[PDB]
Design a protein around this ligand. Sequence first.
Ligand SMILES: *CC(=O)[C@H](C)NC(=O)[C@H](Cc1ccc(O)cc1)NC(=O)OCc1ccccc1
Length: 215
Amino acid sequence: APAAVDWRARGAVTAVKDQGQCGSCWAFSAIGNVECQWFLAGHPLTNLSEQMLVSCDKTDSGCSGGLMNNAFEWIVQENNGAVYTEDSYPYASGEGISPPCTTSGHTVGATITGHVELPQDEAQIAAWLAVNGPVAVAVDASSWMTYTGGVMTSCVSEALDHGVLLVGYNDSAAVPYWIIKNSWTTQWGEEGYIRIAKGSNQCLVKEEASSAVVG
Ligand SMILES: *CC(=O)[C@H](C)NC(=O)[C@H](Cc1ccc(O)cc1)NC(=O)OCc1ccccc1
């Protein structure tokens, strides 16, 4: 596997966004992964819509929570593989309320054919990431309100409660780390990003990792 890969330095990752008061982390995780996978399939990097999932994905619960894998399959099975551009369906759940779904007036910005679920093994997750790109992951984010910067070498790891995007790793650093994109604005952590130690299942990072496959 390569020593260090950071997909941000390869034009593959869009800017950090904000879920606001809505419990929509699952939607941000799922869409961020689709955005990166579309770019790596040889298309221009385009911002895609989390609102589409929060308002229209009735197999999840909007501002109450949801699962990245249910979102990926709602796209393929209920929305004919289509993901709308963020520009044509902007975020509207910042106040913690999800408005009724709108089924027209939007534009398709990417399509996916399905999704794969990766092994519960950090080394294996890293080998796939290095070739194929960013992966959606679920974590225990209980301690993340105290994250100020640096490599978090210890993290409360006992219940998965938040979905985020894994965009790289560096195994040649003093402590190998994972690089994670979050959705609590740029004002949190390292410009919206967090680095956690890699190799000890910090914040339960290896437990629920998956990715969309483009088509
Ligand atoms: C991050 C956030 O905004 C909130 C309120 N929580 C969720 O979105 C949870 C994220 C998560 C947690 C564990 C996983 O293994 C994966 C993602 N999800 C959660 O609340 O899942 C609930 C659910 C809703 C509808 C149908 C089935 C399950």
